[PDB]
């Protein structure tokens, strides 16, 4: 698709069996999901935002489907207000910014 | 141009006569620049995301140039970690997400 930016660029994702809404976010290095119980090994990490830092759980090699596109990547789980798909996964789905 | 997302999507902007680098951020509703002097009236505002909120100065109807494209719109100034071009200006320059 070509997604205009008059509204937030929200898409449906599927992760750990669950459907969720998430924001396609060119301003995020990483993909950050709201608190959820995901199985698997994880490592603690601190990530920065506009207001300061949050602690997240880093899960590697996680299958995730973004607006119909299958991907496998790192997912961070922690207290973000909104699920965000960052550049690590945007690149896997072939996303570009055009103007 | 069509900008891939292997690296942060940083572009040159001109604001208030000065040249700066900024991040094209589809995950931001609005545009916020690092502390600087700008001419004009402003009002205080809170903005936020990961990590909570910061207090900014909101300037309305400010001319800005983004990678060679002129736009006019609301520019926020405050202690953001990086200069951020949000949707309010991305739309002005015809920016879309494509995959």
């Amino acid at each position: 698709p070509q997604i205009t930016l008059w509204k937030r660029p929200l898409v449906t994702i599927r992760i750990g069996g669950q459907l969720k809404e998430a924001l396609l976010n060119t301003g995020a290095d990483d993909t950050v999901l709201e608190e959820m119980n995901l199985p698997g090994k994880w490592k603690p990490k601190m990530i920065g935002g506009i207001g300061g830092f949050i602690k997240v759980r880093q899960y590697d090699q996680i299958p995730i489907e973004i607006c119909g596109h299958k991907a496998i990547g790192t997912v961070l789980v922690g207290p973000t207000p909104v699920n965000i798909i960052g550049r690590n996964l945007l690149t896997q789905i072939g996303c570009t910014l055009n103007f | 141009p069509q900008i891939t997302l292997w690296k942060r999507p940083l572009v040159t902007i001109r604001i208030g006569g000065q040249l700066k680098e900024a991040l094209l951020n589809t995950g931001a509703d609005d545009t916020v620049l690092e502390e600087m002097n700008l001419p004009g009236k402003w009002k205080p505002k809170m903005i936020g995301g990961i990590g909570g909120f910061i207090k900014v100065r909101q300037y309305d109807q400010i001319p800005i140039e983004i990678c060679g494209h002129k736009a006019i719109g609301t520019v926020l100034v405050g202690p953001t970690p990086v200069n951020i071009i949000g949707r309010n200006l991305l739309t002005q320059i015809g920016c879309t997400l494509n995959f």
Partner: peptide, 10 residues
């Protein structure tokens, strides 16, 4: 609501 979801890996 919050509206600026800039995110950085340290």
């Amino acid at each position: 609501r919050p509206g600026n979801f800039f995110q950085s890996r340290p």
